[PDB]
Scaffold this active site. Structure first.
Site, short mmCIF file in Angstrom:
data_model
loop_
_atom_site.label_atom_id
_atom_site.label_comp_id
_atom_site.label_asym_id
_atom_site.label_seq_id
_atom_site.Cartn_x
_atom_site.Cartn_y
_atom_site.Cartn_z
N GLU C 38 43.89 44.20 33.01
CA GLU C 38 44.79 43.10 32.68
C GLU C 38 45.21 42.30 33.90
OE1 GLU C 38 45.49 42.73 29.27
OE2 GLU C 38 44.33 44.57 28.90
N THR C 43 39.17 36.62 33.03
CA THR C 43 39.58 35.22 32.98
C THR C 43 38.94 34.42 34.11
OG1 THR C 43 41.67 35.87 31.95
CG2 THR C 43 41.59 33.65 32.91
N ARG C 173 40.73 38.62 24.68
CA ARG C 173 40.49 39.89 25.34
C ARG C 173 39.35 40.53 24.56
NH1 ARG C 173 44.30 43.08 24.28
NH2 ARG C 173 45.23 41.73 22.67
N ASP C 195 31.88 41.47 37.39
CA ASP C 195 33.10 42.10 36.91
C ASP C 195 32.70 43.38 36.19
OD1 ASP C 195 35.59 42.84 35.94
OD2 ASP C 195 35.66 41.27 34.38
N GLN C 199 34.06 48.69 32.37
CA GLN C 199 33.57 50.06 32.55
C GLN C 199 34.72 51.05 32.56
OE1 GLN C 199 31.19 50.14 36.03
NE2 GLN C 199 29.56 48.91 35.09
N1 LIG Z 1 50.02 33.67 31.67
C1 LIG Z 1 48.96 34.12 32.35
N2 LIG Z 1 48.09 34.92 31.68
C2 LIG Z 1 47.03 35.38 32.34
C3 LIG Z 1 46.77 35.05 33.74
N3 LIG Z 1 45.63 35.68 34.10
C4 LIG Z 1 45.19 36.35 33.02
N4 LIG Z 1 46.02 36.15 31.97
C5 LIG Z 1 45.94 36.73 30.61
O1 LIG Z 1 46.23 38.13 30.73
C6 LIG Z 1 45.34 38.90 29.92
C7 LIG Z 1 44.53 39.88 30.76
O2 LIG Z 1 43.66 39.14 31.63
P1 LIG Z 1 42.11 39.52 31.78
O3 LIG Z 1 41.37 38.45 32.55
O4 LIG Z 1 41.49 39.83 30.45
O5 LIG Z 1 42.29 40.86 32.68
P2 LIG Z 1 41.10 41.86 33.16
O6 LIG Z 1 41.30 43.17 32.42
O7 LIG Z 1 41.31 42.14 34.64
O8 LIG Z 1 39.74 41.28 32.88
C8 LIG Z 1 44.48 37.88 29.20
O9 LIG Z 1 45.02 37.67 27.90
C9 LIG Z 1 44.59 36.61 30.00
O10 LIG Z 1 44.62 35.44 29.18
C10 LIG Z 1 47.78 34.21 34.40
O11 LIG Z 1 47.67 33.89 35.62
N5 LIG Z 1 48.82 33.80 33.65
#
Ligand SMILES: Nc1nc2c(ncn2[C@@H]2O[C@H](COP(=O)(O)OP(=O)(O)O)[C@@H](O)[C@H]2O)c(=O)[nH]1
Lengths: 56, 335, 340
Positions: C38, C43, C173, C195, C199
């Site tokens: 998360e 993203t 997600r 990315d 995993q």
């Molecule tokens: N408000 C906000 N939401 C974010 C930001 N970065 C990611 N998100 C949201 O947080 C959630 C987790 O991000 P994600 O990219 O899926 O995290 P990952 O598990 O590292 O791939 C998603 O619903 C994204 O839309 C940010 O800078 N601001």
């Protein structure tokens, strides 16, 4: 999840406890004897003549 | 808690199994072989260098003709070599470069590979194109072996193994029970059973037809990275992050012998028997392959021709050569 | 022989192609994303497609329809379940029936479709003040940061002819379990970004695969600082991220890899720091509970973990990964750091 994992582990262990195991000595003798019938012709044990080595 | 009761029950059953194994340990392998003569110093030389990959090599597998072999590298290439001449027969461009395993079908008609894409890809050598992408694992592909041109078994970081129908692309059977990443598998000579080694530090024997675990073998102190059956189908060897290899016996259901030396503290990546079973060859993180006397537990020789980790090895079906593959981007053929 | 000559010539031709491919590969820029779940990694990957490859087609966007609905349903379910745990009552007692129906309906939903019945249940729940009180206490349970995004747009989302927008896709997600790879060109150079966040396997079995990458982009959710430590109570989420960064930054596998730090979710952080003090995360923190000083403090807490400071620099940027213009500017920052 975890509880579901423990139930299955327990079920599997209940099966494995019932196995009838051979004496280690008997298994070792059979292992030894299989190797002894064959190690004399094993190229990595006895080596290879240069003229018969396909990797020369 | 009910949770409290299950944890103690599992430990109690593990202790019952440990005691039953002890009740059959009437002697040890070292005693049984005490009167066999040592094999003497094993000194192999590099006969062929297979040069061509441009990054770390992660796996290799001999074809059953003891001449062709396939290697997999995260340069994104699967290369099929003629080891007699060192000629390259094929260089397959992978769709995903993050490969961790490859396999040569016994017929010689197909190769397979996969890795962090969680896919086992099948390539037809006799049309080279992707014949099938077997999708279903939820974690990396760590090993795969063909039963024949129609079925393949896989191991995965998702803690399962699977049997696949290649034509339909579906998992026929899922083999569940490991509690850590499964790193390696080996088919029994008659292909009715296979064994897997996992990061739960256990090895498991599986029934292919009935989809069940028959036996769980314990003793290693850390991950098992490599596993290989003994040629008579009644025992197998493991190689572990705990710097040991071990020989396990199916019918005794327990460890027979540990191959180690206080000098060696690094991990083991790969294991293979010589054709007779007298020698157990293992690849190490320290760049060497050590050759063990399988009957005596003494180190009989070393293969030192690599400048980075030995990641894989295999002995030909005819017993004439051993191949090493390495993170230094080379494979070497020894005898 | 005759065949033997052709086999030699074939081998030589393979050698040429292998050399040409290797020369192209040695010129590409390889970027690995890392960071806790998360933190924003997937993203960022999607943003590279939007910025450099013209984004998503309408047919590509239609394929996220089912995950938008599944994300939405799972968000409201998480809030409702938390009300029972936190002992939060509904603002209107009639919502208990809607909550019951939520669970009945969620089991019967068909993928790619949301019935007007289910949409109405979710709408009434989301509007209820007791549901909102629980939502505003999300630091006490696990709730994804896109919950309000979808639920506030339920009317648009629930239309039978709904087609996800690019922002909708950015916010989804989708839990792939394998590696995700994206390719683009930036100033006559070929970039590849990876990315492995999907995993769930053991990292020590494949982290070394990325020895040699040009750079790591390590993502941190700034807004994780105030999350309650619960079942597993060794460390709060921010300190778990610090421990992972310590491990990566100082890793033997990444000695020659540039370390980029994205302190992400700055928009959520800026709002949280108004009502939630940084001391929840760092008890020793004695500064003011303001955006600027607290953000600086976190930056220093991570940068201080670099052990080869004298030989190795950390390239730190504050980001909002869902804001394409913000990501495009941070991307320029990253380009400069790695190309020279
Ligand atoms: N408000 C906000 N939401 C974010 C930001 N970065 C990611 N998100 C949201 O947080 C959630 C987790 O991000 P994600 O990219 O899926 O995290 P990952 O598990 O590292 O791939 C998603 O619903 C994204 O839309 C940010 O800078 N601001």
């Amino acid at each position: 999840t975890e509880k579901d994992k423990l139930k299955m582990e327990v079920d599997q262990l209940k099966k494995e406890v019932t196995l009838e195991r051979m004496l280690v000595s008997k298994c070792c003798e059979e292992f030894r004897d299989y190797v002894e019938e064959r190690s004399g012709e094993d190229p990595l044990v006895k080596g290879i003549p240069e003229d018969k080595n396909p990797f020369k | 808690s009910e949770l409290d009761q299950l944890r103690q029950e599992a430990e109690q059953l593990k202790n019952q199994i440990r005691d039953a194994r002890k009740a059959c340990a009437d002697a040890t392998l070292s005693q049984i072989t005490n009167n066999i003569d040592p094999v003497g110093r094993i000194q192999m030389r590099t006969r062929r260098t297979l040069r061509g990959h441009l990054a770390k090599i992660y796996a290799m597998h001999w074809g059953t003709d003891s001449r062709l072999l396939v290697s997999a590298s995260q340069d994104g290439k699967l290369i099929i070599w003629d080891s007699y001449t060192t000629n390259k027969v094929h260089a397959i461009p992978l769709r995903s470069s993050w490969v961790m395993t490859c396999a040569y079908a016994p017929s010689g008609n197909y190769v397979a590979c996969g890795g962090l894409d969680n896919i086992c890809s099948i390539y037809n050598l006799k049309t080279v194109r992707v014949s099938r992408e077997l999708a279903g694992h939820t974690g990396y592909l760590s090993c795969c072996r063909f039963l024949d041109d129609n079925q393949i078994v896989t191991s995965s970081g998702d803690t399962t193994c699977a049997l696949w129908d290649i034509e339909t692309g579906q998992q026929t059977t899922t083999f569940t029970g490991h509690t850590g990443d499964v790193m390696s598998l080996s088919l029994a000579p008659d292909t009715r059973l296979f064994v897997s080694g996992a990061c739960d530090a256990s090895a498991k024997l599986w029934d292919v037809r009935e989809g069940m675990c028959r036996q769980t073998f314990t003793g290693h102190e850390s991950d098992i990275n490599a596993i290989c059956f003994f040629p008579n189908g009644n025992a197998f060897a493991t190689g572990s992050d705990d710097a040991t290899c071990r020989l396990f016996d199916l019918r005794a259901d327990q460890e027979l012998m540990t191959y180690s030396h206080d000098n060696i503290i690094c991990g083991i990546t790969s294991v293979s028997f010589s054709k007779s079973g007298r020698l157990l060859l293992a690849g190490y993180d320290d760049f060497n392959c050590n050759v063990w006397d399988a009957l005596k537990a003494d180190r009989a020789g070393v293969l030192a021709g690599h400048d980075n980790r030995v990641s894989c090895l295999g002995v030909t079906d005819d017993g004439m050569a051993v191949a090493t593959g390495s993170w230094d981007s080379f494979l070497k053929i020894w005898n | 022989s005759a065949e033997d000559k052709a086999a030699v010539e074939r081998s030589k031709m393979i050698d040429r192609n292998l050399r040409e491919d290797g020369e192209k590969a040695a010129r590409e820029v390889k970027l690995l994303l890392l960071g806790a779940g998360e933190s924003g990694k997937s993203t960022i990957v999607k943003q590279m497609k939007i910025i450099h490859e013209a984004g998503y087609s309408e047919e590509e966007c239609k394929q996220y329809k089912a995950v938008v609905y599944s994300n939405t349903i799972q968000s409201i379910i998480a809030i409702i379940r938390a009300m029972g745990r936190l002992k939060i009552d509904f603002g209107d007692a009639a919502r208990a029936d809607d909550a019951r129906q939520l669970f009945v309906l969620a089991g019967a939903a068909e993928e790619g479709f949301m019935t007007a019945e289910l949409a109405g249940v979710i709408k009434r729940l989301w509007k209820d003040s007791g549901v909102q009180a629980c939502f505003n206490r999300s630091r006490e349970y696990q709730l994804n940061d896109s919950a309000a995004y979808y639920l506030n747009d339920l009317d648009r989302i629930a239309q039978p002819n709904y087609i996800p927008t690019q922002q909708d896709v950015l916010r989804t997600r989708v839990k792939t379990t394998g590696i995700v790879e994206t390719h683009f060109t930036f100033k006559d150079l070929h970039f590849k970004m990876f990315d492995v966040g999907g995993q769930r396997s053991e990292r020590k079995k494949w982290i070394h695969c990325f020895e040699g990458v040009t750079a790591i982009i390590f993502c941190v959710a700034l807004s994780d600082y105030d999350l309650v430590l619960a079942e597993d109570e060794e460390m709060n989420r921010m300190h778990e991220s610090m421990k992972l960064f310590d491990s990566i930054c100082n890793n033997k596998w990444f000695t020659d890899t540039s370390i980029i730090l994205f302190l992400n979710k700055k928009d959520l952080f800026e709002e949280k720091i108004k009502k939630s003090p940084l001391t929840i995360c760092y008890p020793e923190y004695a500064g003011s509970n303001t955006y600027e000083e607290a953000a600086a403090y976190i930056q220093c807490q991570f940068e201080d973990l670099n052990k080869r400071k004298d030989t190795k620099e950390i390239y730190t940027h504050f980001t909002c990964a869902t804001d394409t213009k913000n990501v495009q500017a941070a991307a320029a920052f990253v380009f400069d750091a790695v190309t020279d």
